[PDB]
């Protein structure tokens, strides 16, 4: 996250770290959202790959022991059937992970709440991105979970010529864009938490930034719009 601040230990308990086996150890690669005790929502490009993954829940500092972590295997990966890795801008950047065991819920680990199908946010809606990714363009990962305030930018403005143009679709959310704060590498897969009717829900899966850099004036961070996928999500959970 560029332009962010450290999150409190307990404020985003559905954030997860998706990790891969890496030489003799494990390395963070993406975020995700815990949505069921044994299901994780992440980006399809995060799983685009023949790696071995684990998920960590109850995580705050990647490199030090908190009191609170649980480490769990991935037993099944379900990418969206229309995902095309040669075309990110087509959409469909979403994936579900079945975990090997169910996690135990607590104040550090809770289910993320999903939006109602079809829900579209107003322009400038209050949202936060969270994650351990880069804190500057070309920089290094955060050791602690960061957050940034990233208000939404509606489809009409985002798909305009000065912003993203036709790269963005109606099946995505844009947020941010001020040149200051951003998602960045290592944050994709993670949530965008938006305040609606007094509760935070997860409206975005972080997907892409500008080829120029993470925090670039009026190229907001782009997210998969979760509310486009609620039937799909429910159908996968119900069939496997």
């Amino acid at each position: 996250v560029v332009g962010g601040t450290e999150a409190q230990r307990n404020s985003w308990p559905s954030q997860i770290s998706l990790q891969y086996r890496s030489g003799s150890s494990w390395a963070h690669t993406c975020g995700g959202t815990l949505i069921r005790q044994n299901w994780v929502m992440t980006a399809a490009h995060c799983v685009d790959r023949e790696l071995t993954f684990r998920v960590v829940v109850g995580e705050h500092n990647l490199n030090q022991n908190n009191g609170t972590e649980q480490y769990v295997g991935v037993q099944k990966i379900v990418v969206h059937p229309y995902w095309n890795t040669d075309d990110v801008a087509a959409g469909y950047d979403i994936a579900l992970l079945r975990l090997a065991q169910s996690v135990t819920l607590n104040s550090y680990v809770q289910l993320g709440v999903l939006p109602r199908a079809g829900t579209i946010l107003a322009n400038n809606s209050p949202c936060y991105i969270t994650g351990w990714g880069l804190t500057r363009t070309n920089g290094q990962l955060a050791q602690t979970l960061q957050q940034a305030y990233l208000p939404t930018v509606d489809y009409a403005i985002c798909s305009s010529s000065s912003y993203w143009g036709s790269t963005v679709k109606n099946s995505m959310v844009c947020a941010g864009g001020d040149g200051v704060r951003s998602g960045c590498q290592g944050d994709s897969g993670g949530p965008l938490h938006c305040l609606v009717n007094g509760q935070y829900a997860v409206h975005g899966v972080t997907s892409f930034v500008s080829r120029l850099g993470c925090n670039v004036t009026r190229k907001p961070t782009v997210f998969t719009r979760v509310s486009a996928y609620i039937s799909w999500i429910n159908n996968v959970i119900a069939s496997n």
Binding site: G186, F208, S210
Partner: peptide
Amino acid sequence: XRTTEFYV
């Protein structure tokens, strides 16, 4: 676009 991972 550039995807958020390394480097997708």
